[PDB]
Amino acid sequence: APFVAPNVQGRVIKESGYNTKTFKPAYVKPKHVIDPNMIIPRQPGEALGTG
Amino acid sequence: TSLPNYLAGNGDLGSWEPTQIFAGEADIVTEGGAAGADIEIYQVIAKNAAGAMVPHDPTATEVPAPQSVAIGIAAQPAKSGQNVPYYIGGVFNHAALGWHASLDTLAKRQAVFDRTNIHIGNLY
Numbered sequence: 001a002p003f004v005a006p007n008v009q010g011r012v013i014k015e016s017g018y019n020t021k022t023f024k025p026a027y028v029k030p031k032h033v034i035d036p037n038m039i040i041p042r043q044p045g046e047a048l049g050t051g
Numbered sequence: 052t053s054l055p056n057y058l059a060g061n062g063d064l065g066s067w068e069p070t071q072i073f074a075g076e077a078d079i080v081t082e083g084g085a086a087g088a089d090i091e092i093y094q095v096i097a098k099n100a101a102g103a104m105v106p107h108d109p110t111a112t113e114v115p116a117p118q119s120v121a122i123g124i125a126a127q128p129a130k131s132g133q134n135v136p137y138y139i140g141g142v143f144n145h146a147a148l149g150w151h152a153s154l155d156t157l158a159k160r161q162a163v164f165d166r167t168n169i170h171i172g173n174l175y
Contacts, residue, residue, distance in 0.1 A: 036055070037054065040055040
């Protein structure tokens with residue numbers, strides 16, 4: 001703080017500003033097509049012969 | 052290799068016919084030795100000039116070559132260099148065995164083994 005003799009008025013102090021930032025997000029679209037080609041086939045779980 | 056089949060069809064699992072090798076009770080005798088050529092199950096095999104098993108080959112030569120005398124029946128398949136187990140004694144169905152060409156009729160198939168502990172014959 002400024003030292004100021006008790007008689008006189010005092011001194012005026014400057015102050016600071018602001019700064020700003022902004023962002024747009026990204027977009028994501030994974031998808032699958034599920035054919036009978038992919039469903040009919042066996043799944044390791046199934047037994048042999050008669051799944 | 053996954054791709055299902057859609058079109059309808061007649062589905063068979065194939066067929067099975069017992070391969071009856073033995074036709075008698077003469078005691079069975081088995082040995083084993085290095086193969087000199089590719090050998091299939093129950094194929095009739097000689098021993099080549101180097102002493103390695105080789106599929107029997109009549110008329111190989113000039114003096115007939117040692118491939119030309121049968122010596123046993125392969126008990127399991129093998130590639131060259133591998134050891135082949137093979138029968139040397141027993142009574143065998145002439146049809147179950149693998150035979151050379153031109154060695155077709157049972158008469159000839161027996162003529163290949165009269166002098167030995169192997170005998171080859173019919174099944175009733």
